[PDB]
DNA sequence: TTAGAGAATTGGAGAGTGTGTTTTTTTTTTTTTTT
DNA sequence: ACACACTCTCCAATTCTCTAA
């Protein structure tokens, strides 16, 4: 499955 | 030196000085552009006085303020029933008696957006009544669609009020009853006038469409009309 | 089929409407002065290039015009032939 | 099946009561817990449920069951804390073995449940399903363990260690040494558990703290206070410092590396040195806020949003455009900008690192973490005593391990080593920059030849295999070594070390490195810049130089510099000083003027120099305006001497032999 | 070192589908029948 | 039937990779 983290999330 | 922001101007002085004899006509025919030009002239002149005469006053304070011209004594007064569709967007002068005033209405001027995921924020300018919402969040690493959202109580607003003006009995036709017209007024002039007051005004005579229903963009063929005042006496 | 997309291409640049206009006029268009600030003169240079870019190909934002130009500028041999022709004219 | 699943859950629940319970004779409202029987078998079978079943089936279901029945919070902590407090009172006075057996086996489960979590394309679909939820439950674990009696379970774990400190190494059996590994393996987890990372399946393009958890429960600030009261820092300090004397180095010194990584991570050193104060700086910040407000006001119309007229602008060749709004009537700069801003398209865009916990490598570190005063001074004391006591002896051991084991490494151990080196060397340099009581000799093990080879070899191997995260960390470590060298040269063998550091092979590598940076994330390019600044400055003070500098100057380096410079709204005051230092080097000294006559530089200087961007009084404007003045003077001269450059300014320079030489000069 | 041939990833054009719409006072001026 | 909101689908524009001169 194409699992992916929100690597860019840093607020 | 009094710390104040508005300048009166009776238009006859434009006819006395030779270089502005034609500007007088252009004012009546193109008020929205000409008045804006006058505003940005006055503010620059105020800055020039303190920097040329090298005075102690804070330049930042003067840069922060808004300055506005208010023209008056423009010409002959016009009968309320005799305004015609060839007068739209020209300057007008009216005499009458005040019936009632609605309470102050908040009018939006700047919108405030915040990103739901990364908490980036943007302030946006309102013109022509339409909010120019961004397509995607503008932070480089968070370039995502539908990602921004509006925050109502962090926007910026301004005061609007509507005044109901009635025809003076001196002009009414034989065997008839007086009519009335509605005036839109903003900022400084908002709470100036009470029921039973007798006044003379100056403002652009405007017209706008109205919708057939609140669901769709369908407009009616008849247009609403009103006056947008810039001075009261 | 759907309508094919419209793009910037070297043919537009090599057209008479294109790049020759800049070389025909740039000497007369821009003017620097020591009598005005860096920011002043710097702003001045971009005016002509912006209006010319709009007149050439109004699709896109100015930056995108420059960065688009890089690709075709590096790749197309005919455009490069024209450019070496310019610098040969100065070698003449 | 679901029923087999719930049968195991029920089996676990029954085991979650066979364990024991408090006493309802007690009239002590409440008493502590009280002990069951078969409980050895109970603990052992739970251990089997993890190892013999869940691991063999790769599930995490068993952990979900124990979390359902709250085993950690409910039994394990009071069993341990009662053992500890009983033995504490007995020590105050100054079958019992069975009690101690229970103490050991409860701790081993605490290590197992709080062990940190890894997800790959080889993890089971079961684990991938359960990842997000078990994260929540481990967050609960961290909060609880730090909270009970103000954290008193942590005294039990070190008392267990103290039994095995006790008697001579010459006696200490392999089973015995596992306790001393186990205890330290516990504290690593308690520091490592932190708020979740959101993850989803990329099928369609469209917080995780549970209701009982908050940030102040979970912050690194809390962990400092908790360890200090419960007497941990003395244990890590004594244990690391006497490490050279015959504690078998092999069992301790990697776990003991991971601790130091796991709470140096997320500190900027400047936050530990100061360089009503809070209120004063807050007031100053409000002045900055007022300036931003002023900037918005300068673009705001006086009269309302429906008063607005209409504007027409006529070009050469008598063609006309239309724009709306009242400020456009007077400001052509705004009208020109507003005209282009309406247009819809943007070109779509391209994008380096995964598999490891948040750190300097993939986060913007211009964002501190925040300390009580007692915490600030206690943390400063801990790492200061660590540096003055432990650092050389630790690095010497861990490095002369890894030279014998480099082939077998895994990505994490590489990224740990390179970000433990970096932190401590930098912090010491800063501390002795500040004050004379500190000295540089304390960190001097980094320079000796073996470690220099090893950092080099890591960077080499990482670059060749195109592993970009290790390459990034190795870049950071190799930066600091060079920085430390310039310090020591400003005071014998160090020149020998330089000459070996700047063999031709390495110059090929260190020259190569900024060129590829253009594609990658904003930190990568920043690492490249700072390393380049240091690398050239050392070789300037070597006195070769002209060969080396010409090696650096070409189009693909300049491309990186501009691509980085245009994101200046996000960057520091200091980094822009570094970029313009380099442009001064390219433009004035080397006299390679032809590189910078390219249009997207000319746009940039307007944005940044305008009333838009860089502040009217920041030190940056001194450098920028002093640069642009000279730029435009030389550009004027060039354009009038040879008018072909008007069409030159759009494009890259032209690499033909016969015309190109005259073109560049 | 350039460039050109082949493969993979993404955008949005535009075609399609389903949907919603017409439509008991309480206070105040005036006429009328009732005591 | 007439503006809208929302879903689905195909096709080509784009960038990335490999090979040889
Ligand atoms: Zn965002």
CB-based contact D177:D202 (threshold 8 Å): no
What six digits make up the tokens of C60?
């896109």
Range of the domain at B136: 77-233
Reading the block at residue D263, the tokens are 């709470």
Straight-line distance from the first to the last Cα atom of chain D, in angstroms, rounded to the nearest whole number: 79
- D228's CB contacts (< 8 A; 6+ apart) are D375, D378
Which residues, 6 or more positions from D502, have their beta carbon under 8 angstroms from its beta carbon? D539
Cα(A11) to ligand 1 centroid in Å equals: 8
Asked how this structure was determined, the answer is cryo-EM
Residues of chain A in Cβ contact (below 8 Å) with chain B:
6, 8-11
Q: Report if CB C70 to strand F is under 7 Å.
A: no
Query: Residues C12, C18: contact at Cβ < 8 Å?
Result: yes
> C-alpha distances in angstroms, D476 versus C29, D225, D527, D568, D636?
49, 31, 7, 22, 41
**CA-CA distance, D598 to D654, in Å (whole number)?**
12
Residues in chain B within 8 Å Cβ distance of A8: 118, 141-142
Chain D residues within 8 A of B108 when measuring between CB atoms:
305
Q: Are D302 and B68 inside 8 Å of each other by CB? A: yes
Residue (of D86, D68, D150, D78) closest to D110 by Cα position: D78
Beta strands in D141-224 (DSSP E): 199-201
Reference B126, options D309, D304, D343, D298; nearest CA is D304
Tokens coding D202 = 């990329």
**Could you check whether the bond before residue B124 is cis, i.e. omega within 30 degrees of 0?**
no
What's the gap between Cα D99 and its chain centre?
Answer: 43
Q: How far apart are CA B140 and CA B144, in angstroms?
A: 9
- Smallest Cβ–Cβ distance between D308 and the set B32, B109, B146 belongs to B32
How many other β-carbons are positioned within 10 Å of the β-carbon of residue D635?
20
How many other CB atoms are there within 10 angstroms of residue B84's CB atom? 9
**Cβ D454 vs Cβ D396: under 8 Å:** no
Tokens 């931003």, located at residue: D292
C2 touches strand E (CB under 7 A): yes
Give D398's Cβ-side CA count (13 Å radius). Answer: 26
Residue nearest to nucleotide F13 (CA to C1'): C5
Using an 8 Å Cβ cutoff, are D659 and C84 in contact? yes
Q: Residues D496, D497, D498, D499: what is their CA dihedral angle, to the nearest 10 degrees?
A: 50
- DSSP at B96: E
């Amino acid at each position: 499955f194409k699992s992916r983290a929100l690597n860019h999330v840093k607020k | 030196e009094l710390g104040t922001s508005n300048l009166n101007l009776d238009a006859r002085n434009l006819l006395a000085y030779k270089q502005t004899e034609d500007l007088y006509h252009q004012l009546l025919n193109y008020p929205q552009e000409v008045i804006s030009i006058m505003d940005q002239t006055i503010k620059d002149c105020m800055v020039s006085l303190i920097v040329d005469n090298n005075l102690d006053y804070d330049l930042d304070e003067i840069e922060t303020k808004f300055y506005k011209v208010r023209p008056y004594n423009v010409g002959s007064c016009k009968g309320m029933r005799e305004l015609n569709p060839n007068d739209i967007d020209k300057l007008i002068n009216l005499k009458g008696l005040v019936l009632r005033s609605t309470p102050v209405i908040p009018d939006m001027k700047v919108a405030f957006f915040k990103c739901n995921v990364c908490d980036h924020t943007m302030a946006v300018e309102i013109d022509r009544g339409v909010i120019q919402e961004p397509a995607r969040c503008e932070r480089i690493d968070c370039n995502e669609p539908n990602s921004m959202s509006l925050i109502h109580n962090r926007c910026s607003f301004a005061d609007k009020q509507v005044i109901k003006l009635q025809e003076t009995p001196d002009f009414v036709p034989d065997g008839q009853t007086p009519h009335s017209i509605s005036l839109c007024v903003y900022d400084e002039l908002v709470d100036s006038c009470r029921a039973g007051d007798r006044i003379e005004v100056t403002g652009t005579f405007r017209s706008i469409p109205i919708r057939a229903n609140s669901r769709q963009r369908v407009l009616k063929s008849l247009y609403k009309t009103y006056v947008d005042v810039v001075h009261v006496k | 089929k759907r309508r094919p997309q419209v793009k910037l291409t070297a043919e537009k640049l090599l057209s008479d409407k294109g790049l020759p206009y800049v070389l025909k006029n740039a000497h007369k268009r821009i003017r620097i002065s020591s009598k005005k600030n860096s920011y002043d003169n710097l702003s001045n240079i971009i005016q002509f290039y912006q209006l010319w870019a709009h007149e050439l190909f109004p699709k896109a934002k100015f930056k995108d015009f420059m960065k688009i130009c890089q690709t075709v500028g590096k790749t197309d041999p005919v455009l490069r032939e024209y450019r070496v022709s310019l610098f040969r004219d100065e070698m003449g | 099946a679901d029923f087999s699943l719930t049968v195991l859950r029920a089996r676990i629940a029954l085991l979650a009561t066979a364990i024991g319970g408090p006493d309802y004779t007690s009239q002590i409202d409440p008493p502590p817990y009280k002990l069951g029987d078969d409980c050895l078998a109970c603990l052992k079978d739970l251990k089997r449920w993890f190892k013999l079943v869940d691991d063999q089936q790769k599930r995490w279901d068993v952990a979900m069951a124990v979390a359902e029945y709250r085993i950690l919070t409910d039994d394990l902590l009071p069993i341990l804390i009662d053992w500890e407090n009983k033995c504490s009172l007995a020590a105050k006075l100054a079958n019992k073995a069975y009690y101690d057996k229970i103490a050991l086996n409860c701790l081993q489960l605490l290590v197992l449940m709080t062990w940190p979590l890894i997800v790959t394309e080889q993890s089971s679909s079961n684990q991938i399903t359960l990842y997000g939820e078990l994260k929540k439950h481990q967050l609960v674990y961290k909060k609880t363990i730090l909270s009970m009696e103000s954290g008193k379970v942590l005294r039990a774990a070190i008392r267990l260690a103290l039994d095995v400190i006790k008697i001579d190494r010459l006696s200490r059996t392999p089973r015995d040494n596992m306790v001393l590994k186990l205890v330290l393996n516990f504290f690593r987890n308690v520091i490592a558990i932190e708020p979740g990372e959101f993850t989803i399946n990329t099928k369609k393009s469209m917080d995780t703290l549970p209701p009982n958890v908050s940030m102040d429960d979970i912050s690194l600030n809390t962990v400092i206070s908790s360890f200090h009261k419960n007497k941990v820092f003395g244990f890590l300090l004594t244990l690391t410092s006497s490490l050279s004397k015959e504690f078998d180095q092999d069992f301790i010194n990697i776990p003991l590396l991971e601790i130091m990584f796991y709470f140096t991570k997320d500190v900027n050193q400047e936050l530990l040195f100061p360089r009503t104060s809070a209120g004063f700086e807050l007031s100053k910040l409000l002045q900055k806020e007022h300036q931003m407000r002023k900037n918005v006001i300068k673009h705001t119309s006086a009269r309302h949003s429906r008063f607005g007229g209409l504007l027409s602008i006529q070009t050469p060749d008598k063609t006309r455009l239309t724009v709306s709004g009242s400020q456009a009537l007077v400001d052509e700069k705004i009208a020109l900008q507003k005209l282009d801003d309406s247009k819809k398209w943007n070109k779509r865009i391209i994008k380096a690192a995964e598999g490891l916990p948040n750190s300097l490598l993939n986060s913007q570190t211009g964002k501190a973490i925040f300390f009580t005063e007692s915490n600030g001074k206690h943390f400063k004391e801990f790492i200061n005593n660590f540096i003055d006591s432990g650092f050389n002896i630790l690095l010497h051991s861990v490095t002369n391990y890894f030279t014998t084991e480099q082939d077998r490494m895994v990505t994490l151990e590489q990224v740990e080593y390179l970000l433990f080196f970096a932190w401590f060397v930098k912090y010491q340099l800063l501390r002795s920059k500040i004050d004379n009581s500190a000295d540089i000799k304390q960190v001097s093990e980094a320079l000796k030849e073996v470690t220099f080879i090893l950092v080099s070899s890591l960077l080499r191997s990482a670059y060749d295999l195109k592993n970009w995260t290790v390459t990034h960390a190795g870049m950071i470590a190799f930066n600091e070594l060079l920085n430390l060298v310039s310090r020591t040269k400003a005071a014998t063998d160090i020149e020998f070390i330089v000459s070996r550091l700047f063999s031709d092979e390495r110059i090929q590598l260190l020259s190569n490195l900024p060129k590829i940076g253009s594609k990658y994330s904003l930190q990568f390019m920043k690492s490249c810049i700072e390393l380049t600044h240091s690398v050239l400055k050392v070789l300037e003070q070597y006195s070769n130089f002209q060969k080396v500098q010409a090696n650096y100057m070409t189009e693909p380096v300049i491309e990186t510099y501009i691509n980085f410079l245009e994101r200046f709204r996000e960057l520091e005051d200091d980094s822009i000083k570094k970029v313009f230092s380099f442009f001064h080097r390219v433009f004035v000294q080397a006299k390679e003027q032809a590189l910078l006559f390219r249009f997207d530089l000319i746009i940039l200087l307007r944005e940044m120099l305008s009333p838009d961007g860089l502040d009217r009084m920041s030190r940056s404007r001194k450098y920028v305006s002093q640069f642009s003045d000279y730029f435009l003077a030389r550009l004027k001269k060039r354009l009038k001497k040879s008018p072909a450059w008007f069409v030159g300014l759009l494009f890259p320079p032209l690499h033909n032999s016969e015309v190109g030489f005259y073109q560049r000069y």
